[PDB]
From a paper:
pmcβ-l-Arabinofuranosidases hydrolyze β-l-arabinofuranosyl units from arabino-oligosaccharides (AOS), complex pectic dietary glycans, and plant-derived glycoproteins such as solanaceous lectins. Two representative examples of gut microbiome β-l-arabinofuranosidases and the subject of the herein-presented studies are HypBA1 (classified within GH127 and expressed by B. longum) and BtGH146 (GH146, expressed by B. thetaiotaomicron). We recently reported that both Bacteroides thetaiotaomicronBtGH146 and Bifidobacterium longum HypBA1 are inhibited by β-l-arabinofuranosyl cyclophellitol epoxide, supporting the action of a zinc-coordinated cysteine as a catalytic nucleophile, where in most retaining GH families, an aspartate or glutamate is employed. The β-l-arabinofuranosyl cyclophellitol aziridines both inhibit and label β-l-arabinofuranosidase efficiently (however with different activities), whereas the epoxide-derived probes favor BtGH146 over HypBA1. These findings are accompanied by X-ray structural analysis of the unmodified β-l-arabinofuranosyl cyclophellitol aziridine in complex with both isozymes, which were shown to react by nucleophilic opening of the aziridine, at the pseudoanomeric carbon, by the active site cysteine nucleophile to form a stable thioether bond.
In order to gain structural insights into the reactivity of aziridine 2 with rHypBA1 and rBtGH146, it was cocrystallized with both enzymes, and the resulting complexes were studied by X-ray diffraction. Electron density for the carbon emulating the anomeric center (C1) in aziridine 2 was observed at covalent bond distance from the catalytic nucleophile residue in both isozymes (C416 for rBtGH146 in Figure 3A; C417 for rHypBA1 in Figure 3B). The covalent complex of rBtGH146 with aziridine 2 displayed the anomeric-mimicking carbon C1 at covalent bond distance to the thiol group of C416. This points to the expected regiochemical outcome as for conventional retaining glycosidases30−34 and provides further evidence supporting annotation of this enzyme, like rHypBA1, as a retaining β-l-arabinofuranosidase utilizing a cysteine catalytic site nucleophile. In particular, the primary hydroxyl O5 in 2 was involved in H-bond interactions with distinct H-bond acceptor residues within the binding pocket—these are E217 in rBtGH146:2 and H142 in rHypBA1:2. However, no cysteine equivalent to C415 of rHypBA1 is present in the active site of rBtGH146. In the rBtGH146:2 complex, N1 of 2 interacts exclusively with a proximal glutamine (Q689) in the active site. The crystal structure of 1 in complex with BtGH146 revealed an unexpected regiochemical reactivity: the catalytic nucleophile C416 appeared to have formed a covalent bond with the pseudoanomeric carbon (that is, C6 in 1), instead of the expected carbon17−21 corresponding to the anomeric center of the parent substrate (C1 in 1), while the HypBA1 catalytic nucleophilic cysteine reacted at the carbon mimicking the anomeric center (C1).
Residue numbers in the entry:
A (entry chain B): 22 to 491, 497 to 506, 512 to 802
B (entry chain A): 22 to 491, 497 to 802
Write the structure that this text describes.
């Protein structure tokens, strides 16, 4: 049939490696969560009495119920991988509690969003008030319920719960009823609010049941404004919130898989193609070396990574989790597209890069804790979640990440096995009566062995992946380019057979994709990093506060971080492998400033924890050293000085900064000009500024040619002091700097913008509070 | 300072090669033109008495003066390359005649457009009536005068005429005065009419004079509706006339070069970036293997090359000429963008591909004659211009093309020479006291030798381009292996104290590749190294292969061959690729020794370089099929494609409303009319009326009009003012909603001309008409 299939997690057992460690640490974190707290939002909205308070953080500020969704997925997948009894009891319990909630309402509805029944009543009637991250005064409710749809799906598919299947079908039938009276225009209006991968889950329900009404529902939930450009090979992603988009694209691809033999619809190949193009543009133009994307959750321009190297909010972990889910889908049928009937190993090159360097790095391996933002800025650190405090999106996906490292190691195609990832594992290839063990100390050693533990004397082809970054193969003791490919080995495999091969690894120096003067060291597919200090690791284990996912500690000026001096080729050659069982390197070349520790020590980024770090280093030629150092010593130092005086910061029109500052508005809009986001209002808009130290100054950014004006109120007191207008920057933005008449005291403070004798407010692009 | 510079044409002498042949053939064609005929439009509009009638064709049907513009450029550049005295005398004469015209009016105006003074008076006052290809009833006058601006610039920069400089400044100052009373809105409205690269030329005048007012004028003449998407990495080019857009983008890039140190404007990198993105999208998504783009002069969708493989109007030559000018600009500062101080050789990969396969193929090498359209349809031919008859845009650019093959062979950067094209040449590198000779029989042999003929004992780096499609070199007998640095295109540095008598030998390994049509339909062309190969498929019905002066004589109107009669490659692409084998002899020649249908009874299919294939029908792209799918593919081609060919071979005349050249060729008139696109097809309609003259070479029985089915607006049809009242036979609607109305005429239209006029039939608009076809 040529169909490539994936193994279930039951049939791929992880052996001793960093991936098994990560699985076991995640198991401990999953088991630390209290199911009564995660179920509490659901019971409340069903009119039942909760057994415990919900979690705080996002679980009581509008996204109540989203972690419960992920919890079902993570439980279900971890159960499939491990067979853990404690997990089993938790999953059974959680499913039954949500079942009680579903019975109490009796329509199929399950949800945690505060005032859910009121919300979905409004929507069914055609009262749809959508913003980018809001629907009828609620925080991304469609995104929220998607995690339940996905959770119940996963409980059926991975854990074999018939109860979950029935719960999922009732919940999907419920949404058919909610949307039965809405036009396509109304649907697409509603889908302007972030809605996760609802279209994926509804396509999943179509495959599970075999009923095309769910496939009709999936297409109605496919957001057209994103899809239509991607069909025509157009990247319009600049300025967009990135994690919003990737689950839609997963969705479009899934609709195409499940619609492959629908006679009444002929748009499958188009939707498939659109997803392939999306993957192409994000991976090859918008991704850093660790495999992630986005800055402050948003796609910056692909010709300008300045913000990637300057902002502490580097790639979000959810985005990579989702990019890997998309990768898995695209690889599966990649042979059908090019008509080779052979899947494309370049998808695996990316899978490996992102899994080893971003997913594996995003969990603290001993204590546990999940990362939201991984700064690519040289010399900052990343913040970890804690079980009871942190209810972020990146916790949710974090719980899922480490359950399923077995999922992409192999793939099967009739009589053919693809050996894709070099991860110690035992495979049960039941369809050919084969058991197989892969052993390797990779990435700390080059050798891989594949032992046939059991076989039924049938002719089978092992397709061994030969990566870009890597041909002698020893079969049964018998000894026997430059492109992602596969080496076929066909034998009547019997018990005791042994395939030995080596993966040659080299140092590369990989430039930031827009070709600015920044480079990271890699060894094979492993991103290396240096530890730059352990000072001011503020909130490294997060509390439950809004914005506790961000690394808010002191910003170090870039001139204090090691800068690589010379030509890239000699820089690359000056990194030297140290001896020992683990990957470790020293950079022994020209550096600025002087290194007191003699030389720079680099290790795999996935092992660098509880520390500030550089992955990308600033580079400078000897010719350009003077002017580069002047820029870093003056302009960059002052920008760091500004950040270290900053007490609070809001980016209007960016959903999480606004959500974190308790955005309220009346008759308001958001948008983009010159790659910066803004909000404005005909009515008003407001935030709560959170003030850890006393503040002397407020600093508002507008465009100079915007002739609309704004009154500013601070706790209802009108600010009448005249701003110090700065010179307009290249793109037409000016800062208004207001010396406040009294200091804002430690605590909270409302800032409100309403129009000053014009229709709109000024479009505000930044709100910053300074000492 | 690590800036890359180009050599002047005076310092790069072409040696014996196909490029020198092409230069010398173009010289003969340039000298065949009568300067009194080319100057006649200019003298007329100045109120002077011409010494001869203007040329016919486009020189008396609205674009009068456009070839005179190009003539100045071609003369100037050919003078620089050759030092030919006859060229010098022609240029001097032409400049003086246009100077007399400029003096007679005395405002700075020089132009050939009929009623020029009246036109520019209207425009200065703010009476602007712009269409896509018209301004105040005149055919692309801004495009026309651009050729004069460019011609005078070239006479200064290449030939060192101070008179041309002064004429250029007066003409630019004249346009400052014309546009001094117009708002930005009015400018941008006027720029909806095709205007060539006026913004480029005005930026050129800014650099020549050093006065920023010309740079301000250049930005005012930059069309924003095209620029603004390109700044944001958005390709919206589908449906657009392609040669209209590329000179604007050249313009935007040139404004960025000349604005590099302007403190009062900070948009240079944006405009530079927009041009780089444009180059990227056209080359990597919209270009065929010969390096060209467009079908019927327009950008089709990049996921659908069906029209590229069906239509006799393949890539236009002007587009590649212009793409190569943009390439040269982008390569020059490419090292500054990535801050490597090393220019990007992938620009050269394209330059080579387009130069060898499109530009070099577009001139008949012995007789002369320039090509307008190069069909990628399997089994058609291309039409050549003739000196006295053909005044097309592609003649104008054609005259320029072959003057300047010396321009991109090398580049220099202080102590570094880039050896980019493998073209026999003698280089005068005055800046390092070096004379150098490149000798090679490439593409017919792999060996290149570089001889140092003169040097001043300085350490200098020769950067030898190593193309994608291609490491042992030899300096003075001694062989020197270096590591194969990458599969990708790169430069090999060789640094010595070069002295007289030194010799660098290297080889360029060439392989057969099989390049698929970019949308991945089952069509492939053979290449050997960067050379596109082709097979000759016959010499039947080469109608108008040397064009007369008629409207539409640029198109290859001969009988279309059914695709089933053309060789189809049978088997998997890998085996197809391996089955092409090099024949012996000094010249590139191949036989395809694999499976072909229809079958070859006598000899294998013979493939040669497309640039040597002339006076013949050809295939570059072949249809491909597996052995499993062979039967059903042949059955499909024997019905549907055959019938489409049968229709075309019955066709006596054809018009595509809303496409500028078909309409212009059929004498478009209208009142209260609009054009536009639906489902990738162009249309015109009117509240007043619109009309054409149908040209009828043989007697015609039938008229066939295409509309959308759901358009409820209707049209009366008049043929020479007699109303056509016969009922059309309505065809079934195709997939995109289009129906053909087929009218059996009551009498045959006789051989000659005939007006067709559409006015509304009891509705506000006419029906939107997408095709008008006259059949026997
Ligand atoms: C040919 C010619 N008609 C010119 C002006 O309209 C166009 O640019 C080219 O396509
Ligand atoms: O809005 C819900 C999620 C979003 O997908 C991600 O970027 C983070 N903001 C949360
Ligand atoms: Zn997240
Ligand atoms: Zn042309």
């Amino acid at each position: 049939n040529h169909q490539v299939s994936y193994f279930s997690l039951q049939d791929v057992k992880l052996l001793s490696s960093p991936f098994l460690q990560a699985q076991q640490t995640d198991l401990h974190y999953i088991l630390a969560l209290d199911p009564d707290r995660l179920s509490a939002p659901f019971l409340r909205e069903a009119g039942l009495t909760p057994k415990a308070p919900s979690y705080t953080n996002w679980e009581n500020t509008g996204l109540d119920g989203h972690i419960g969704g992920h919890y079902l997925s993570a439980l279900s997948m971890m159960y499939a991988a491990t067979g853990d009894t404690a997990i089993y009891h938790r999953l059974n319990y959680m499913l039954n509690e949500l079942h009680r909630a579903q019975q109490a309402v009796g329509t199929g509805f399950i949800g945690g969003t505060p005032g859910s029944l009121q919300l979905w009543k409004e929507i069914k009637a055609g009262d749809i008030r959508a913003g980018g991250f809001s629907l009828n005064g609620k925080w991304v409710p469609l995104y929220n319920i998607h995690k339940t749809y996905a959770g119940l799906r996963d409980a059926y598919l991975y854990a074999h719960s018939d109860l979950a299947r029935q719960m999922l079908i009732d919940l999907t039938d419920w949404m058919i009823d909610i949307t039965s009276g809405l036009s396509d225009n109304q649907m697409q209006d509603m889908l302007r609010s972030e809605h996760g991968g609802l279209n994926e889950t509804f396509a999943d329900v179509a495959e599970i049941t075999g009923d095309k009404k769910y496939l009709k529902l999936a297409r109605r939930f496919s957001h057209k404004v994103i899809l239509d450009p991607l069909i025509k090979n157009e990247d319009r992603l600049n300025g967009m919130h990135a994690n919003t988009q990737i689950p839609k694209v997963i969705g479009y691809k899934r609709v195409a898989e499940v619609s492959k033999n629908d006679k009444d619809w002929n748009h499958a190949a188009e939707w498939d193609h659109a997803a392939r193009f999306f993957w192409n543009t994000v991976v090859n133009h918008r991704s850093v070396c660790i495999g992630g994307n986005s800055v402050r959750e948003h796609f910056h321009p692909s010709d300008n990574f300045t913000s990637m190297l300057n902002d502490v909010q580097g790639p979000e972990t959810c985005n990579t989790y989702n990019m890997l889910r998309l990768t898995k889908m695209l690889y599966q049928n990649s042979g059908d597209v090019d008509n080779s009937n052979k899947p494309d190993p370049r998808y695996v090159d990316y899978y490996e890069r992102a899994l080893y360097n971003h997913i594996l790095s995003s969990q603290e391996p001993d204590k546990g804790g999940f990362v939201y933002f991984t700064p690519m800025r040289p010399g900052h650190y990343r913040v970890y979640s804690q079980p009871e405090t942190s209810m972020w999106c990146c916790v949710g996906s974090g719980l899922e990440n480490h359950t399923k490292y077995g999922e992409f190691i192999y793939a099967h195609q009739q009589d053919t096995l693809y050996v894709n990832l070099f991860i110690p594992s035992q495979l049960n290839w039941k369809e050919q009566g084969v058991t197989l063990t892969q052993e390797t100390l990779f990435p700390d050693d080059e050798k891989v062995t594949l032992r046939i533990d059991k076989a039924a004397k049938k002719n089978l082809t092992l397709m061994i992946r030969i990566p870009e970054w890597a041909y002698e193969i020893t079969i049964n003791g018998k000894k026997h380019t430059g492109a992602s490919t596969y080496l076929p080995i066909r034998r009547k495999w019997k018990k005791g057979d042994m395939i030995t091969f080596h993966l040659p690894m080299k140092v590369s120096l990989e430039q930031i994709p827009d070709k600015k003067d920044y480079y990271a060291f890699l060894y094979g597919p492993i991103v290396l990093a240096t530890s730059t200090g352990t000072e001011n690791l503020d909130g490294i284990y997060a509390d439950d506060s809004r914005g506790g996912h961000i690394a808010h500690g002191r910003q170090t000026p870039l001139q204090e971080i090691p800068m690589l001096i010379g030509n890239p080729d000699s820089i690359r050659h000056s990194l030297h492998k140290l001896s020992g069982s683990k990957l470790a390197f020293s950079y022994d070349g020209n550096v600025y400033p002087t290194q007191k520790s003699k030389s720079l020590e680099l290790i795999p980024f996935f092992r660098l924890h509880n520390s500030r770090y550089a992955v990308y280093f600033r580079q400078a030629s000897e010719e350009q050293f003077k002017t580069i150092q002047e820029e870093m010593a003056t302009a960059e130092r002052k920008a760091t000085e500004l950040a270290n005086r900053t007490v609070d910061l809001i980016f209007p029109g960016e959903q999480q900064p606004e959500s974190d500052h308790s955005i309220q508005y009346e008759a308001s809009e958001t948008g983009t000009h010159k790659d910066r986001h803004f909000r404005r209002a005909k009515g008003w808009f407001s935030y709560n500024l959170k003030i850890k130290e006393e503040a002397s100054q407020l600093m508002i950014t507008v465009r100079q040619e915007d002739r609309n004006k704004a009154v500013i109120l601070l706790n209802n007191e009108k600010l009448t002091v005249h701003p110090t207008v700065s010179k307009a920057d290249k793109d037409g933005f000016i800062r208004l700097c207001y010396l406040l008449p009294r200091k804002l005291k430690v605590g909270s403070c409302e800032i409100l913008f309403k129009p000053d004798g014009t229709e709109w407010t000024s479009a505000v692009y930044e709100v910053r509070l300074l000492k």
